[PDB]
Design a protein around this ligand. Structure first.
Ligand SMILES: *C(C)CC(=O)c1ccc2cc(OC)ccc2c1
Length: 247
């Protein structure tokens, strides 16, 4: 991994030692990026609803994962399950249960630094994984992209700035997430997110990552070429908001 500071360095070290699972998935991969493109054709706003109890951004709640997932199955293009334990209060069992409770595609959301974490995602039923440019060297990111693809996954490669984008495009990312919160400052920076979106070629499926959001903002971003929205806090706090965000 990169040499990092603070909580991000800590979560990387923890991830390096994450024990792997032994499990068999129950169905083939369903492509998340392809379903997004289907929703786009039909002008159905494509929201990837996040299940996570906690975040360093300030979310800290309890909610039954299966009840949340079954509600979201009706509306969301896919679900993202944050499996990082220490900072996000996630778990592999949470992913397993959700992926086994609904029919729509599943993103595993964690700090992936080794191949066995991709094995874990696949074996627990996820359809794809998040890879984060900032935490990996370019060589590591390239290798993990290839490894995900060897399972039939197209990972969601998460960028925070132009430097991250340069790397992601060079290695041929086809599914890019654009953060709204800055790793360096801890602050929401919506202007930077829109700039980055405008730098991504049309052949890449683009996902805007958001905690709080509102329908107005979704419409504007869609206008700018965003294909889908990865939304956490506001849906964890009020699940029914997704209906207003897509209608
Ligand atoms: C996405 C799974 C997480 C995300 O974008 C995020 C969460 C929390 C957080 C905290 C920061 O400083 C405390 C910076 C960035 C950041 C990003």
């Amino acid at each position: 991994p990169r040499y990092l500071k603070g909580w991000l360095e800590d979560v990387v070290q923890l991830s390096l030692r994450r024990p792997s699972v032994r499990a068999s998935r129950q169905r083939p991969i369903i492509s998340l990026n392809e379903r997004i493109l289907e929703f786009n054709k039909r002008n159905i706003t494509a929201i990837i609803a996040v299940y996570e109890r906690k975040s360093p951004s300030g979310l800290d709640v309890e909610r039954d994962p299966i009840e949340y997932a079954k509600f979201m199955e009706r509306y969301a293009v896919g679900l993202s399950i944050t499996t990082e334990e220490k900072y996000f209060n996630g778990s592999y069992e949470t992913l397993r249960k959700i992926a086994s409770s609904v029919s729509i595609p599943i993103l595993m959301s964690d700090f992936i630094v080794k191949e066995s974490q991709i094995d874990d995602a696949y074996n627990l039923g996820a359809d794809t994984v998040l890879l984060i440019v900032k935490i990996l060297t370019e060589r590591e990111l390239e290798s993990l992209l290839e490894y995900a693809r060897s399972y039939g996954m197209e990972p969601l490669i998460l960028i925070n700035d132009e430097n991250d984008l340069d790397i992601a495009l060079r290695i041929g990312a086809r599914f890019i997430g654009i953060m709204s919160r800055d790793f360096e400052t801890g602050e929401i920076n919506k202007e930077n997110q829109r700039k980055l979106i405008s730098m991504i070629p049309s052949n890449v499926v683009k996902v805007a990552k958001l905690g709080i959001s509102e329908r107005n903002e979704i419409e504007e971003l869609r206008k700018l070429g965003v294909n889908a929205f990865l939304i956490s806090s506001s849906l964890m706090r009020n699940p029914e908001k997704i209906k207003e965000l897509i209608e």
